């Protein structure tokens, strides 16, 4: 049952994000919206938290390819009812208020009711056979050095930022009974597809941020109390 | 996983060997969060980039490991002096760097390499580099990869279970060395722990494709 | 089957919060269900190998909702405070409890330890070099907080039950009180 390859670890489901869906949310409203890049979660800010297994492992490689799977678990009961539409968008992105632009792409409409979960394979449609990682191959900065344009100019590579997105919009407004909660949380999982690939070993993007202590000489280094 | 772990990881970058000591100790354990640098902590002989290697990232997920490790040691010299690399089995301690064993001030008459333990010599004039394979000479079934706190003073027998022994380098005269480490052919990992809490700031030190 | 202490899940409980945790077998001997007949062989024998099965039974009403996760960490001594999140739990062998539906979940726990046997009991004469009675850790964690309706219950309860599928004992000795 133990994973043999890096691709086996990428096939483990991991919680990316969470979003709320309420009865106040009008039709065509973006409940969820993100750039699907397993290289970096953000291009414009620091990340700190529990990254998904497929993102963690993709951080070790310079290249990735293949479909990415998603799973939307709705933390609800039987009395909650509504409809959403998941949409994989390519090349160009849609306006936040324009639902019709999202509907034109590769979509799956989910009728929430008794079933409180939906799977979604995101097709890999790019100009290249593989995508290079947005993160760096080698980063010698260890002590949070204040960056300048000269430092950026002398970087390892140039970040090819992805414009490909997945969005979740309201089709039918959530109409739960008065007895139950009006708003529900939706857990967004991700993993690599069955034909997910990785290549080009490099410096890891992610590194432990909690309870990091270097080893000392036991017992010479003041272990005898 | 095994293919990744069998490539070499650089541990020590140009570290001094001093003949006043017994030798430079290397604890037999793979690269992991145990050897990770944190900005602010005390300066060690270890390199800062061990934590961010592919293998270290893999070994953070598995808390058990069994089998042999392979150590590539390079002596920065072209002299005819022999530099000895002695293997110590699992005794129960965990040390690194230069150490005077039993705090003596003379070790040429009582060398560790001429005590009885398994030893191999490097002759830099012939070859300054060597690759030595250390066995799994321990009482335990598995060797523990990491702990939550490496510097915590807990039960002393359990404290030493993170290593399977030591590798001690002893020179004739003062000379520097560099050390790599990798997994052997006979090597396994187990006890999958899953991914820990992590941080990154790679975005900040690079331009986008739109200038 | 032997029941252990009740677990209270409230609306105040956030994601990643430990509802309960168990260092096994220690906590099933000398804290939870101390008068159980399951604990009788541990009094006399010093060593053993242990494969467990843990059932969880939740009871929240239909107008409530939430998610709880229970996972196992093998050989967790001095590694309980790392790889101890909801994400690490989802990776390791686990079960998921929906608090509205009240689905049951069963954790099959094998013996995965760095030694041959685990020590059963500490003693005054016994060594302090090896910390006994711990080959694994169980964690009960909030995946999604509990929510309720207008004028509804602000909490609901979960009850764990344990049993040894394969408990082999070794090294007979004089009987002692457990911890």
């Amino acid at each position: 049952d133990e994973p043999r390859t890096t691709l086996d670890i990428a096939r483990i489901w991991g919680l990316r994000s969470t979003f709320n869906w309420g009865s106040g949310d009008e039709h065509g409203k973006e409940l969820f919206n993100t750039v699907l890049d397993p290289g970096l979660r953000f291009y414009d800010q620091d990340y700190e938290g529990q990254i998904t297994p497929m993102e963690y492992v993709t951080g070790l490689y310079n290249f990735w390819s293949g479909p990415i799977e998603l799973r939307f678990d709705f933390v609800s009961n039987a009395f909650h009812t509504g409809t959403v539409i998941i949409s994989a968008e390519y090349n160009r992105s849609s306006t936040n208020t324009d639902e019709c632009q999202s509907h034109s792409t590769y979509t799956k409409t989910f009728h929430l009711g008794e079933q409180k979960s939906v799977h979604f394979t995101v097709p890999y449609i790019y100009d290249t056979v593989v995508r290079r990682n947005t993160a760096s191959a080698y980063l010698p900065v260890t002590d949070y050095d204040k960056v300048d344009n000269v430092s950026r100019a002398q970087a390892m590579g140039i970040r090819a930022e992805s414009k490909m997105r997945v969005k979740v919009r309201v089709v039918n407004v959530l109409r739960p009974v008065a007895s139950t909660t009006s708003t529900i949380e939706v857990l967004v999982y991700m993993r690599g597809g069955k034909n997910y690939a990785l290549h080009g070993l490099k410096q890891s993007t992610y590194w432990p941020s909690n309870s990091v202590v270097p080893i000392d000489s036991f017992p010479p280094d003041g272990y005898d109390p | 996983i095994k293919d990744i772990l069998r490539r070499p990881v650089l541990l020590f970058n140009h570290v001094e060997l001093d003949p006043d000591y017994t030798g430079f100790f290397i604890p037999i354990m793979p690269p992991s969060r145990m050897m990770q640098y944190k900005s602010g902590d005390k300066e060690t002989s270890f390199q800062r980039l061990i934590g961010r290697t592919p293998q270290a990232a893999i070994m953070n997920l598995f808390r058990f490991w069994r089998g042999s490790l392979r150590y590539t040691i390079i002596i920065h010299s072209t002299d005819g002096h022999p530099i000895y690399v002695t293997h110590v089995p699992h005794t129960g301690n965990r040390v690194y760097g230069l150490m005077k064993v039993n705090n003596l001030h003379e070790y040429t008459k009582v060398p560790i390499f001429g005590c009885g333990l398994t030893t191999e010599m490097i002759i830099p004039s012939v070859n300054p580099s060597i690759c030595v394979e250390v066995p799994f000479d321990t009482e335990n079934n598995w060797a523990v990869t990491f702990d939550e706190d490496a510097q915590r003073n807990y039960s002393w027998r359990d404290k030493g279970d993170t290593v399977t022994g030591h590798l001690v380098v002893t020179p004739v005269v003062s000379v520097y060395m560099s050390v790599w480490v990798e997994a052997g052919d006979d090597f396994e990992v187990s006890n999958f722990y899953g991914p820990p809490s992590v941080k990154t700031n790679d975005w900040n030190y690079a331009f986008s494709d739109e200038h | 089957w032997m029941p252990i202490n009740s677990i209270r899940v409230t609306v105040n409980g956030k994601r990643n919060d430990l509802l309960a945790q168990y260092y096994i077998p220690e906590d099933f001997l000398s804290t939870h269900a101390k008068c159980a007949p399951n604990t009788i062989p541990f009094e006399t024998y010093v060593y053993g190998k242990y494969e467990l099965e843990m059932k969880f039974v939740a009871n929240g009403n239909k107008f409530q909702c939430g998610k709880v996760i229970i996972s196992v960490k093998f050989d967790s001594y001095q590694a309980d405070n790392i790889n101890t999140g909801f994400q690490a739990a989802l990776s390791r062998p686990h079960i998921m409890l929906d608090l509205s539906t009240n689905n049951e979940g069963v954790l099959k726990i094998p013996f995965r330890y760095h030694r041959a046997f685990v020590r059963n009991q500490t003693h005054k004469t016994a060594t302090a070099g090896v910390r006994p009675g711990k080959f694994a850790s169980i964690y009960v964690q909030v995946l999604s907080p509990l929510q309720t309706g207008e004028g509804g219950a602000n909490d609901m309860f979960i009850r764990p039950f344990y049993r040894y599928t394969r408990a082999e004992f070794a090294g007979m000795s004089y009987k002692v009180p457990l911890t």
Binding site: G222 | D149, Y154 | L18, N81, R131
Partner: peptide, 26 residues
Amino acid sequence: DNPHRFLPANVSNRWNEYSSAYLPRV
């Protein structure tokens, strides 16, 4: 001295590890 050596009394048990009762460690 080194603060990693010994845990504070409120969070830890007799053995100098995080107590099972102390849930807030996470």
